């Protein structure tokens with residue numbers, strides 16, 4: 001069955017809610033014992049969103065190695081992603097420590113700092129060249145180098161300095177700024193254009209550490225980004241592009257972080273994204 005006819009039949013049938021609940025029912029359940037330790041309560045944004053112990057990113061410190069972040073490793077596609085929550089006021093230094101230690105080239109942000117009149121993550125990068133940020137708890141300095149503001153996204157060049165060794169690296173910040181406060185975008189054209197801007201940068205390539213991807217919880221919009229990227233890469237690698245099963249790829253990804261794709265509308269949008277992508281990709 002051709003992906004876009006399961007979708008046209010799910011649409012003809014309006015069964016999106018039924019498909020989505022079948023995924024929720026078959027998803028992996030692994031322990032998250034480190035996330036639930038009392039010493040870590042102020043390191044979690046949402047009580048119901050935690051990294052599994054087996055796939056969690058460890059900070060390189062003896063004090064407390066915990067961050068709300070997971071390694072998604074896709075064996076057949078040969079892609080890895082780190083999915084994390086939007087940083088909290090007390091975890092902005094941990095966030096940049098992780099980017100440093102994992103050798104990431106890119107950070108992908110899919111939310112605004114304020115949405116629906118409430119704060120969805122800390123202001124964790126500098127807004128002016130001449131006002132740099134210092135994270136005293138992790139010994140890092142972060143400077144804004146340049147900013148390119150477009151209609152659907154902004155790309156920033158940042159300089160991260162390890163103050164312990166005086167090594168520096170260039171980090172690219174890819175900020176999708178137009179996801180609506182409610183629901184999903186009507187067309188996937190701008191999100192797809194955005195995905196191909198991150199690829200073109202080198203940030204997803206095996207010469208670097210994994211890309212860091214976040215939204216507010218790091219499971220819904222973040223899940224949509226990695227699911228569309230991996231499905232399109234599998235369609236380019238395999239003999240029969242029609243063999244790629246988006247529901248099976250999503251369940252593989254849910255072995256590494258809980259809750260990826262938060263709504264039936266995010267599942268339909270993911271299908272739409274890979275359909276138009278593949279209409280021009282095979």
Ligand SMILES: CC(=O)N1C[C@H](Oc2ccccn2)[C@H]2C[C@@H]1CC[C@H]2O
Pocket residue numbers: 189192193196276277278279280281
């Ligand atoms: C319809 C559309 O605009 N798309 C954008 C994108 O194509 C590229 C490739 C390289 C550089 C820029 N855009 C994606 C998804 C979809 C179709 C083909 C697929 O590669």
